[PDB]
């Protein structure tokens, strides 16, 4: 049926006729060898079509076809990369980057993944596009190694949009969860953004502070900061406490779980805790006792 589909796509009367047909095709599943068929055809159409709307869905279709169990996304990653270089609207590019991420995870081979990562570092530098930036951070995070990647992500830590800030934090967080070891540079960066205006950002920030805290409890912060030198974990515990007393109801939830999960806090600081500031919203209240008991054992 592969060559019939070809014909139907061009025969579209108007731009929005084309759009619907693609949409309808989305809803019928495609087998291993027909997915190869349609990918090619849909790329061809993409070249020749001047309306973004249709380009965007073509990209979505492409992603769906990438995700097919039988399908192996080879001989058409190069094509994807080629189209990236010579595309012009940020939305479509972001969608294609998403497709690329899907492709990356589909096959775990070292070489192609690295290629894709480099491509997305290139696309990471995109300007006044909140969305290409976010997609890029996601993909870097997803396809990343095991150092350069980690260093890159801090650049976008300090970005105009809080929406990019969050993505960066989550990306680092992701890198941890695939067995990597973050640096103390990352720790300092996380402490620097714990007190941003946006609620999202703060949520993510403590998440990370906790992450790096568990990574380096033994390590110490030399900086006195108006007191004598104390442990990294000590300070992390402190910063997470502050958040319990922060002006949001969901920021506190972030803190509570992490505060409870903290280990090898000094007996002094652990005793001193203002975890008895449980108030207002009764969800937080209930949550903060749960882990209390888990770690009263400790």
């Amino acid at each position: 049926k592969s060559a019939a589909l070809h014909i139907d796509l061009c025969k579209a009367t108007s731009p929005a006729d084309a759009l619907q047909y693609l949409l309808q095709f989305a809803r019928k599943p495609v087998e291993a060898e027909s997915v190869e068929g349609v990918v090619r055809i849909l790329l061809e159409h993409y070249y020749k079509e001047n309306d973004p709307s249709v380009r965007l869905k073509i990209a979505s279709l492409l992603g769906l076809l990438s995700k097919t169990a039988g399908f192996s996304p080879d001989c058409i990653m190069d094509d994807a990369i080629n189209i990236l270089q010579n595309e012009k609207s940020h939305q479509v590019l972001a969608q294609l980057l998403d497709t690329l991420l899907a492709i990356g995870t589909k096959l775990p081979e070292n070489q192609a993944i690295q290629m894709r990562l480099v491509d997305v570092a290139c696309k990471h530098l995109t300007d006044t596009s909140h969305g290409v930036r976010n997609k890029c951070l996601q993909l870097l995070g997803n396809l990343g190694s095991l150092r350069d990647v980690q260093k890159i992500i801090g650049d976008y830590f300090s970005d105009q949009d809080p929406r990019v800030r969050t993505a960066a934090i989550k990306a680092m967080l992701q890198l941890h969860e695939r067995g990597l070891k973050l640096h103390q540079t990352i720790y300092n960066q996380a402490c620097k953004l714990l007190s941003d205006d946006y609620e999202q950002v703060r949520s993510a920030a403590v998440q990370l502070i906790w992450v790096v805290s568990q990574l380096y409890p033994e390590s110490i912060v030399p900086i006195p900061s108006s007191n004598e030198e104390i442990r990294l974990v000590d300070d992390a515990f402190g910063k997470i406490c502050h958040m319990v007393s922060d002006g949001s109801w969901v920021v506190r939830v972030q803190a509570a779980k992490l505060l409870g999960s903290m280990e090898q806090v000094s007996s002094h600081f652990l005793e001193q805790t203002l975890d008895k500031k449980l108030m207002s919203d009764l969800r937080r209240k209930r949550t903060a006792h749960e882990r209390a008991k888990e770690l009263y054992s400790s």
Partner: peptide, 10 residues
């Protein structure tokens, strides 16, 4: 409502 034409994430 159709979910396909635009990704929900975006």
């Amino acid at each position: 409502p159709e979910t396909e034409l635009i990704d929900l994430s975006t």
